[PDB]
Amino acid sequence: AFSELLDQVGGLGRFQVLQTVALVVPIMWLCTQSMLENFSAAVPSHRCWVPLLDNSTAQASVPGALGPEALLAVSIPPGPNQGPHQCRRFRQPQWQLLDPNATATNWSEAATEPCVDGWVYDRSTFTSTIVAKWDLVCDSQALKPMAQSIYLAGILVGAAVCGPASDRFGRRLVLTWSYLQMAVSGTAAAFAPTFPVYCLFRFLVAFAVAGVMMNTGTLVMEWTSAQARPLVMTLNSLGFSFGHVLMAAVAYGVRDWALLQLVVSVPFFLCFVYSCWLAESARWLLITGRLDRGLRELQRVAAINGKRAVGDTLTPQVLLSAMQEELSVGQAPASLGTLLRTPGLRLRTCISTLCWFAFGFTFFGLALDLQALGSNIFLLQVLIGVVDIPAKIGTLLLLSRLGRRPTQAASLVLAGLCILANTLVPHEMGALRSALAVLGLGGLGAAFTCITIYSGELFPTVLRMTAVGLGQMAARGGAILGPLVRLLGVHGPWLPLLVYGTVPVLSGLAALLLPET
């Protein structure tokens, strides 16, 4: 509400703490849902089905016993990198390759056949996975990144429909509905019997996740007093950062693709159930002509906060008088027609959108394929969650005692350079590769939290909202475009990482030009 009314009710009190505690918790499950792909879409080694081994009759027919390692060569051509071909099989068994003396160069997939009878996967680490369930390998390999992109697409559409809708019906209504939709779609996706159904439900989940993300931030921002807004926003950001540790702790327990999704998405039913006693912001209520309900909510909060007499003395006349400032000037959002037209301000917008897209792209493109970065996914997830926090706390101190522009440029350049260096080092040293990847992700996180603050300060007060929205849309579009880059991995796994490392470096170098503060 207006500063006078909010101060009369109380800037900080019980209700603020209760609402913050209620709203931060779902944010950890809004990060578990986003990062569930690393564990529910893993790619295990997939040999080609062979009747000699799986069908026990044929194997037992041969007198004596033949070791599986020695009997595998006779029916699998030697694939690249001294391994078994992932999507080929011998047309007929070749006992000539059985003798180790003969060179295996003559034995190749020139006279082989495709995987007609299906693939055999590994159940040592993951008991089940979507890839092993719908054969998303070989010719369907490209279908794995696609599922990651569509989900991100949903998020982009959500902010396009949760923007105006929440400005007409309210904040709490949209938040509750989005919680319900998240819970229902997550519960339903676990039972999807075909790939397109799962993709559709994932897209709907992304839509609801965007709605929750916007509404939860708007509701927190409005109610908290002016002096304590960034302090609560950073807590809201730290919740999402602890979401990574939560994800790492959950996946280690259940090894499945349906149980994991169901367990992750079930708590949103409780989130919806208890989300009915949260108060609707009176700021939105009063401006939109809803006076009586806003007054009732204000009195309710005043009674909650421990000041009864103050709330009792309130009357609609004082309420109308105190909010005349907002009513007189009905600030209408200004379109881009008055933003890009001024030549002087063009560079600022260009560079800001460049930074927002660079981070939206590289961080989603790198985090989603967490396997290629290190050795074991669980340790990488835990370390990302642990390291994100200190970087996010230290960025604020850096900004206080150092310029915004140097900090932004240095963080972005260092993140990009660490990501790039991760590829060059060999695979013998898993520890160093994992450490470099973790540092790169932490740097990207720091750059993102710094640019969030930096963007608003650049432009005047009137044009800040349009620029922030443009940056968010750019940053979302880059996220969508991120996963698609992996389709170049056929040439080699190094090219996607090279691109992910080159983009942030150039963005950070460019971001040194725009003025300070």
Ligand SMILES: CC(C)(Sc1nc2ncccc2n1Cc1ccc(Br)c2ccccc12)C(=O)O
């Ligand atoms: C809105 C938020 C979760 S903020 C936040 N802080 C972050 N820090 C690091 C990484 C993500 C972080 N988010 C969430 C986030 C930001 C930008 C993009 Br694009 C996202 C795309 C998909 C899902 C979440 C996204 C909150 O605090 O309520």
